[PDB]
Amino acid sequence: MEAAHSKSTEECLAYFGVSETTGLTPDQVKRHLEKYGHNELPAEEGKSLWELVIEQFEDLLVRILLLAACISFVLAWFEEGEETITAFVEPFVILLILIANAIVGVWQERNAENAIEALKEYEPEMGKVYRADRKSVQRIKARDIVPGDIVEVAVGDKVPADIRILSIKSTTLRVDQSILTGESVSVIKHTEPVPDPRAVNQDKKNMLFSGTNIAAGKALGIVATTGVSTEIGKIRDQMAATEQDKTPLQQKLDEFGEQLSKVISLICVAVWLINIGHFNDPVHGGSWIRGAIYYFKIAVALAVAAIPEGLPAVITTCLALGTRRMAKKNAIVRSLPSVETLGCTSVICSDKTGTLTTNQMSVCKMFIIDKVDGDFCSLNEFSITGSTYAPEGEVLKNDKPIRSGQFDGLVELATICALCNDSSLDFNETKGVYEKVGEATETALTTLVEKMNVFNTEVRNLSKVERANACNSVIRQLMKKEFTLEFSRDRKSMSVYCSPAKSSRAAVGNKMFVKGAPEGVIDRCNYVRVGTTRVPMTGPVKEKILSVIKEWGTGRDTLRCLALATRDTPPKREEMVLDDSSRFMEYETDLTFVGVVGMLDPPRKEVMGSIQLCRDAGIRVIMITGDNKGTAIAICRRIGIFGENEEVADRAYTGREFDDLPLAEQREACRRACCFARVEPSHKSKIVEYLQSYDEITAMTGDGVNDAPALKKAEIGIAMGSGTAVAKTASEMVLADDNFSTIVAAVEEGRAIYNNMKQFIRYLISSNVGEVVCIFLTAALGLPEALIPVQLLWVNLVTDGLPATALGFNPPDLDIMDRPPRSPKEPLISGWLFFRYMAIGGYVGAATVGAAAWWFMYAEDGPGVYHQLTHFMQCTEDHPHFEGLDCEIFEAPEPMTMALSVLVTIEMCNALNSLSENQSLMRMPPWVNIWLLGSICLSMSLHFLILYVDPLPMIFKLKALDLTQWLMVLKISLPVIGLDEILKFIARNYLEG
Ligand SMILES: C/C=C(/C)C(=O)O[C@H]1C(C)=C2[C@H]([C@@H]1OC(=O)CCCCCCC)[C@@](C)(OC(C)=O)C[C@H](OC(=O)CCC)[C@@]1(O)[C@H]2OC(=O)[C@@]1(C)O
Ligand SMILES: Nc1ncnc2c1ncn2[C@@H]1O[C@H](COP(=O)(O)OP(=O)(O)CP(=O)(O)O)[C@H]2OC3(O[C@H]21)C([N+](=O)[O-])=CC(=[N+]([O-])O)C=C3[N+](=O)[O-]
Ligand SMILES: [Cl-]
Ligand SMILES: [K+]
Ligand SMILES: [Mg+2]
Ligand SMILES: [Mg+2]
């Protein structure tokens, strides 16, 4: 019964045709179970290792290499040469690399925390119902509760279903529903209907929600919904349904794979256009089984040339290091890819209570009467420092610290706050921080009178453990609390009867101490306390009182106020009915007003400056709270989201207000409003979706269950360290130290990481660009010499990998937090850099293919002189022309080493070319990245151990002496620096000119 909250208890009982006294009959339970299922949330296992690994290989660039792995086995079947028996390793090499790049992906998916599992911690195993078969209450499994049966809850219980309250047995029922509102303050339910169909949870004061827990009371209700249909179940579905998109750079890599499967698959099928050479390339034969292999021989190589294999190995070690660095800045990053996505954060969404605020109620201000002379009234207003439940902070008057004992009015104010109070302050010794016991509102009063120290107790050298209640205990000594008139909704106050118990028995006078909502409490005050004396409450006096209350209840310091009053002559205890709470208001009559305390859940101190740093970095901060719009707006102005006098009508909304906008208007409201309050969890989810409809990389910061749907929908969920298990489970990063500042720290880290990532991606691709140029040129020449499919992998995996990874340690930009967030949808290579790598690509593609032709054209030892070299496939048959040379020499060791030597040296230089884009090396020192110089040496160190340690050069081929070969590797390997330099000089100076 969804719209139960808007219907009457009788109506809700009629809906399921159930008596409030008997409950559901056995058959009803049978039918309701069949119709509504079981009261539980469906679990979500997710991972099937088989289905997950088959998801790993559905990537295109691995599907092609996989395709290129089996095709390479076909290149192991020919029996033409003795080397073939050792050439079976070549498909095996590529396969185990596809396995390495596959394990590491699984290595990152293993730590999938189960959000639903964390969330299902909030469903109790048991539940108390009333059914027809028994008069006594039955304690049953909560999953066996159907809509429509009478349910019972009391203190401590975890609400088992979404329940419409029928009868409240206590004078009040008080519920903790932070699960759905993120607010720990206990809310006082009733049973009257809540007519608004579109009411949010915060307005459904006649409902109990599955997952929330009873802070106080005992009530009876009827189940409205169970299972998936409850409010917590809507949190569940959204958590299951939110599928995480891919990283902006992973998106850029995927479009690179699609275009690769285009240009490659259209090159190999365009070679057929130049089969003019295979018209009579045999002496009399044609194309057969052995001869058409050359078309797939150039296909398996063209694939490994374009694929930047080993790049994922580079980026993965890069991210793991950043994870460590951010973990030192107290940013614990659970997902490796979100390290980079963090750098382009456009908009940070943030919860208020517990995220931006300490979630510890604090008394900011207090006032007592100062003087009353006729129509003139003055007050002693004070303020109190400290943003937590600790008894730390001092009272001050006009920004100057003050001791409250000198104000007789403040002594009685502390006495009421300590005695009219069902709550205490515990120092959790394990956490090392003071915690509350009972209501936050009341603990605020406890922690207050500890700061005040009205009797000047020596509290400096106490133990932190018994500092907690040290000053309250002194007040408990002065007056014995006899009984309590509990809070009731009719009077919005509570009071406490007391006796002195020392000097001469109770011959000093019994007294009642009262706190509550100001208006109602003040109206029952006939006198006013001025220090020790009392005077009659008059028109001018109370207006002065109300006035300053109104000023505090609103505006820049929107506080909750409690009026504090005493009854100096309380009725005789034996003429007071303590059962009927309807009688308690007349007992709290003819009172002496004392003072007023103004309460607030204050901001964390690190916030306001963190916000400004986000502002300086072009990052918008949007508060999204389930707390009242008044309070949120008030916090935004201290935080600096809003200015102190800034007009906010158009830029703060409640969820209900937001739902009332046309869909169009809702999307732009997200673009201009920085405050959303009194929201249900789906709202935060929906607001992030709207911000992502502007292609804005958005984060979400929270600490509660109610934050989880948005924590998932955001590109980045950020969980408070002290936050809930379910919020951390849903987040990509956790703030270990609860510092909102460490978000700014993490952005600057991920910002500087994404910049270095672009480099070694460009550097790896610019290599693949030239490597593809190399193979295509060889095929057009008819010369397959000077390149091997197996050689390409090793170089990309190691020779290019190590400088690539070294480019990850580049010194970051100085004014890096002064730039706006990176645009999401621009390519790494686009305009002149395309030309720069397209030229340098073909220029290093021809330096490798030209390395063969030179060896055949001219060499001191190699080889001596011509064109028939292109027709080397005819050394076998047409031998009379190939005179003076053996036929085996065309696959000689030396020419392939040169093309590898220039490929290594060039890429050793293009690595320096990619130390920076568009800045000289004479101005950007290669030694500014000491790691980069290390990588270049170790890559060539492996290249000199690749040529001089027998097994390696056996595959790869012989090495040729320095004096006659290293002369020629520097034909382009060093001009490619000059070339890139010159092209770099152009885009830097000729651009603006
Ligand atoms: C060998 C690999 C590729 C990708 C390639 O060459 O094709 C173009 C191509 C499709 C792109 C181009 C390639 O341009 C060339 O043609 C280079 C010369 C080689 C020609 C082939 C035969 C000799 C990239 C590779 O060229 C350079 C100069 O690197 C740049 C860029 O790549 C990126 O932005 C990197 C993505 C992480 C892409 O325009 C890209 O198209 C896209 O959608 C992007 C956004 O990918
Ligand atoms: N933002 C806030 N700041 C401080 N205290 C708050 C608070 N919100 C609630 N409380 C305290 O949390 C309770 C939540 O009620 P409830 O049904 O959520 O009510 P409302 O938010 O006022 C109506 P609404 O739904 O439109 O937002 C309230 O009870 C007492 O203080 C309140 C109280 N009093 O309010 O008068 C008096 C009191 N004594 O002893 O007189 C004690 C309160 N208390 O909380 O212990
Ligand atoms: Cl509101
Ligand atoms: K997320
Ligand atoms: Mg919160
Ligand atoms: Mg409120």
Side-chain angles (χ1 to χ4, degrees):
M1 186 189 187
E2 288 183 35
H5 86 290
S6 61
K7 299 305 187 172
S8 71
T9 53
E10 180 62 33
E11 283 168 347
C12 287
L13 286 161
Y15 188 85
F16 301 106
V18 52
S19 176
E20 188 182 359
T21 61
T22 56
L24 256 42
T25 50
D27 179 39
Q28 292 191 305
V29 185
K30 203 183 106 295
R31 314 186 320 254
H32 286 212
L33 202 61
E34 281 274 336
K35 172 178 190 170
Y36 302 111
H38 287 219
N39 181 31
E40 64 192 348
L41 293 173
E44 203 206 32
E45 296 187 350
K47 315 177 137 184
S48 176
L49 187 39
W50 166 39
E51 299 176 353
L52 186 141
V53 176
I54 202 179
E55 173 236 323
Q56 163 74 21
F57 288 93
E58 283 190 354
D59 185 37
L60 179 55
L61 75 97
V62 63
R63 275 178 62 180
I64 301 175
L65 290 195
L66 189 54
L67 183 73
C70 53
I71 291 313
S72 279
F73 276 87
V74 183
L75 314 183
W77 281 93
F78 64 77
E79 37 75 35
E80 289 304 315
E82 175 68 9
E83 305 286 356
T84 304
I85 76 177
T86 316
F88 291 83
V89 71
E90 196 268 358
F92 177 77
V93 166
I94 306 194
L95 185 56
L96 59 85
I97 291 176
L98 289 185
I99 297 176
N101 295 14
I103 297 184
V104 189
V106 180
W107 200 75
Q108 314 180 24
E109 211 73 33
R110 279 238 71 176
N111 282 5
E113 289 277 44
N114 190 18
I116 321 296
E117 184 171 350
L119 177 82
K120 287 172 63 94
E121 205 65 29
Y122 295 83
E123 16 187 63
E125 65 168 4
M126 298 303 291
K128 298 174 292 200
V129 311
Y130 280 104
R131 297 187 167 158
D133 51 326
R134 266 154 188 79
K135 273 68 218 185
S136 313
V137 52
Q138 306 184 24
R139 203 171 176 255
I140 76 187
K141 310 275 247 58
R143 70 182 304 256
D144 301 332
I145 293 186
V146 294
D149 50 15
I150 316 299
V151 169
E152 176 165 290
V153 307
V155 283
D157 290 353
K158 219 182 286 183
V159 177
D162 276 26
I163 297 172
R164 170 77 165 94
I165 309 178
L166 300 181
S167 178
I168 306 179
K169 312 306 186 167
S170 336
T171 90
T172 37
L173 180 65
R174 312 213 208 185
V175 180
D176 167 20
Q177 40 191 41
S178 36
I179 301 88
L180 301 187
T181 86
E183 294 294 340
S184 67
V185 156
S186 307
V187 311
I188 291 164
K189 308 303 204 169
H190 58 82
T191 70
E192 296 306 306
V194 180
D196 182 14
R198 319 247 171 269
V200 304
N201 302 318
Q202 286 89 301
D203 300 3
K204 292 174 182 149
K205 301 208 176 196
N206 54 5
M207 299 298 302
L208 300 172
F209 295 96
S210 201
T212 70
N213 74 96
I214 306 295
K218 157 166 179 197
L220 194 73
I222 179 168
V223 169
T225 53
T226 59
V228 178
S229 303
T230 63
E231 222 60 43
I232 194 173
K234 313 192 187 166
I235 306 191
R236 181 219 166 277
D237 298 316
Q238 281 195 319
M239 302 191 80
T242 50
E243 305 298 326
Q244 231 60 202
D245 271 27
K246 291 192 292 277
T247 278
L249 217 43
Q250 183 67 10
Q251 295 188 341
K252 296 299 172 179
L253 292 166
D254 288 21
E255 74 169 1
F256 171 70
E258 309 302 301
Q259 281 297 275
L260 217 58
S261 181
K262 178 59 180 302
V263 297
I264 291 189
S265 63
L266 85 87
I267 282 182
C268 300
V269 310
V271 177
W272 189 81
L273 300 173
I274 317 188
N275 75 323
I276 313 181
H278 278 192
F279 270 109
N280 196 25
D281 186 60
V283 53
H284 62 260
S287 178
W288 273 123
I289 49 182
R290 301 204 310 101
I293 298 179
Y294 199 94
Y295 298 89
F296 294 70
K297 178 71 61 173
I298 68 182
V300 61
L302 194 63
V304 312
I307 298 299
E309 58 263 323
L311 175 68
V314 174
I315 76 184
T316 306
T317 46
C318 174
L319 272 34
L321 292 173
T323 311
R324 294 195 66 181
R325 282 173 294 185
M326 295 173 305
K328 299 304 294 192
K329 305 181 182 301
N330 300 282
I332 300 182
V333 167
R334 296 149 48 90
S335 186
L336 286 185
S338 53
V339 172
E340 160 232 317
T341 76
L342 206 54
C344 47
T345 314
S346 190
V347 169
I348 305 172
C349 286
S350 182
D351 176 49
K352 185 184 66 78
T353 296
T355 296
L356 306 159
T357 71
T358 63
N359 190 17
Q360 303 203 337
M361 204 62 74
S362 308
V363 172
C364 270
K365 301 167 143 59
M366 54 176 34
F367 78 83
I368 62 195
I369 304 279
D370 191 24
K371 289 166 181 45
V372 174
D373 283 33
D375 297 319
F376 179 82
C377 198
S378 59
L379 311 168
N380 277 322
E381 293 172 23
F382 302 88
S383 82
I384 306 94
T385 64
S387 84
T388 54
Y389 285 127
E392 306 169 0
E394 54 287 319
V395 176
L396 49 89
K397 179 182 193 57
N398 290 341
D399 304 330
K400 190 173 197 301
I402 203 169
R403 186 36 60 97
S404 314
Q406 301 301 332
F407 292 82
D408 293 326
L410 282 191
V411 185
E412 196 162 318
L413 189 92
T415 309
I416 306 178
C417 293
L419 293 173
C420 190
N421 196 336
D422 290 336
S423 297
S424 51
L425 195 67
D426 183 55
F427 180 72
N428 181 301
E429 323 189 44
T430 319
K431 297 180 170 295
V433 65
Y434 302 74
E435 296 186 321
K436 69 150 165 125
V437 183
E439 291 306 342
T441 313
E442 284 187 317
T443 304
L445 304 182
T446 298
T447 204
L448 166 60
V449 316
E450 292 299 333
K451 311 177 159 186
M452 296 187 61
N453 204 354
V454 287
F455 294 103
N456 311 332
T457 308
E458 177 78 348
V459 295
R460 323 161 191 171
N461 39 17
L462 304 181
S463 66
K464 190 168 299 296
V465 193
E466 286 177 3
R467 180 54 183 102
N469 306 311
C471 285
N472 283 270
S473 179
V474 175
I475 298 188
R476 300 153 179 266
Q477 300 176 332
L478 187 64
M479 299 284 286
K480 168 139 97 75
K481 172 193 317 177
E482 210 84 353
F483 62 80
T484 284
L485 310 179
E486 53 267 25
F487 177 98
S488 68
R489 272 164 36 78
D490 70 281
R491 75 184 130 104
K492 295 190 182 72
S493 61
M494 71 158 297
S495 66
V496 156
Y497 200 98
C498 305
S499 56
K502 181 45 181 62
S503 68
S504 295
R505 303 180 183 178
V508 204
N510 295 290
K511 302 291 189 294
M512 280 173 67
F513 296 119
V514 185
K515 75 192 179 70
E519 44 170 334
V521 165
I522 292 167
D523 287 13
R524 313 201 296 275
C525 287
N526 286 324
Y527 320 85
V528 168
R529 189 161 323 285
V530 185
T532 305
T533 69
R534 37 184 282 208
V535 302
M537 176 87 72
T538 51
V541 167
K542 80 183 304 184
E543 260 317 305
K544 182 60 183 160
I545 288 166
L546 298 171
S547 165
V548 177
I549 298 183
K550 174 140 59 171
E551 299 168 356
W552 297 4
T554 70
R556 315 172 49 173
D557 51 345
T558 295
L559 307 185
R560 286 283 278 208
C561 301
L562 292 180
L564 294 128
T566 177
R567 173 155 191 168
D568 301 325
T569 294
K572 306 194 286 296
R573 185 191 188 186
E574 68 274 9
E575 55 188 10
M576 295 193 45
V577 198
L578 304 195
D579 317 330
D580 195 329
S581 54
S582 174
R583 214 150 165 84
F584 296 174
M585 189 190 66
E586 82 195 66
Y587 302 144
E588 303 175 358
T589 308
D590 191 38
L591 313 174
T592 309
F593 168 90
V594 178
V596 153
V597 288
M599 239 168 297
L600 178 73
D601 172 20
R604 309 193 134 90
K605 193 167 74 170
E606 301 78 2
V607 183
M608 181 187 53
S610 304
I611 303 273
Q612 188 60 232
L613 295 179
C614 297
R615 197 171 303 253
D616 295 347
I619 299 180
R620 193 162 79 99
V621 184
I622 294 173
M623 179 192 291
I624 307 187
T625 173
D627 199 351
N628 290 162
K629 185 186 194 184
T631 287
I633 297 186
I635 293 293
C636 287
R637 297 183 194 263
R638 321 175 176 236
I639 290 324
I641 284 172
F642 297 136
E644 299 166 21
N645 300 292
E646 160 160 321
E647 218 292 330
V648 202
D650 289 339
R651 35 157 62 207
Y653 291 102
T654 51
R656 181 73 156 84
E657 278 165 347
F658 184 83
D659 294 328
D660 275 349
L661 298 176
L663 277 184
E665 312 286 346
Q666 291 181 352
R667 179 156 169 272
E668 314 196 24
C670 297
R671 203 171 65 191
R672 53 152 204 287
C674 309
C675 176
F676 302 81
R678 193 132 180 146
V679 317
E680 295 183 342
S682 61
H683 284 124
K684 328 193 151 173
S685 191
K686 170 163 47 174
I687 293 163
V688 171
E689 183 178 22
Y690 271 138
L691 297 169
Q692 298 167 341
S693 70
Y694 286 104
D695 298 341
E696 288 228 316
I697 301 311
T698 63
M700 174 52 173
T701 318
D703 67 312
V705 178
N706 71 318
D707 298 317
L711 281 173
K712 288 203 63 65
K713 188 51 199 278
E715 274 75 4
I716 306 131
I718 305 171
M720 290 286 139
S722 52
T724 54
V726 85
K728 315 198 201 179
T729 301
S731 295
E732 282 72 13
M733 188 187 55
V734 172
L735 304 196
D737 63 352
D738 284 342
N739 268 13
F740 201 93
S741 54
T742 60
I743 281 181
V744 187
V747 165
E748 179 176 358
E749 194 66 28
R751 208 164 255 209
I753 292 178
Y754 172 79
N755 290 358
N756 301 325
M757 286 184 65
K758 297 197 306 177
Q759 291 306 120
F760 63 70
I761 298 161
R762 290 168 186 176
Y763 168 62
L764 260 281
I765 300 301
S766 79
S767 183
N768 307 129
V769 166
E771 290 179 358
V772 170
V773 176
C774 181
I775 292 171
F776 182 85
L777 293 179
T778 53
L781 301 182
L783 305 164
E785 179 66 15
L787 184 140
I788 306 184
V790 75
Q791 294 172 339
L792 285 187
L793 275 89
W794 173 272
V795 171
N796 306 338
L797 179 51
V798 171
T799 306
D800 286 5
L802 258 45
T805 302
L807 289 175
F809 302 152
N810 294 331
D813 180 41
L814 301 183
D815 290 320
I816 195 190
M817 294 302 266
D818 290 331
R819 276 191 39 179
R822 194 65 171 96
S823 181
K825 295 182 177 183
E826 89 302 331
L828 308 189
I829 321 180
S830 42
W832 178 253
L833 200 67
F834 189 46
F835 213 87
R836 197 168 117 197
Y837 286 147
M838 182 182 55
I840 216 186
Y843 174 73
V844 311
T848 60
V849 189
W854 165 89
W855 178 268
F856 306 113
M857 259 178 155
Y858 292 105
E860 277 200 342
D861 174 48
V865 190
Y866 204 70
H867 176 89
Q868 292 183 0
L869 159 82
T870 65
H871 307 267
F872 85 112
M873 289 178 293
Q874 311 174 7
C875 192
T876 52
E877 309 289 342
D878 187 26
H879 189 63
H881 298 75
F882 296 87
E883 279 297 333
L885 293 173
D886 190 31
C887 279
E888 194 183 9
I889 311 185
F890 285 106
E891 299 173 341
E894 306 97 356
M896 301 207 185
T897 291
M898 303 302 291
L900 186 58
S901 194
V902 300
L903 188 52
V904 163
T905 55
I906 282 178
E907 291 310 308
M908 286 316 101
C909 297
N910 207 353
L912 298 171
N913 292 335
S914 295
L915 168 61
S916 152
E917 68 136 342
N918 296 331
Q919 264 82 21
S920 181
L921 284 89
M922 298 291 302
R923 297 305 312 174
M924 275 293 292
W927 61 83
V928 85
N929 189 342
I930 317 97
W931 297 96
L932 181 54
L933 306 178
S935 55
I936 304 168
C937 295
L938 197 62
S939 55
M940 288 216 189
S941 169
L942 293 179
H943 189 98
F944 275 152
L945 297 180
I946 214 74
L947 299 160
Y948 277 175
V949 174
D950 277 289
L952 300 167
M954 167 51 73
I955 302 172
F956 297 138
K957 285 162 157 212
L958 295 165
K959 193 268 191 184
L961 290 181
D962 287 339
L963 175 66
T964 69
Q965 268 73 56
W966 263 243
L967 174 140
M968 208 44 171
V969 307
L970 314 183
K971 180 193 194 172
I972 276 183
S973 307
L974 269 39
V976 73
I977 297 186
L979 167 57
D980 177 76
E981 197 73 47
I982 296 312
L983 301 175
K984 195 170 293 182
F985 188 92
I986 292 173
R988 179 174 58 246
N989 300 321
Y990 172 82
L991 176 63
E992 276 63 31

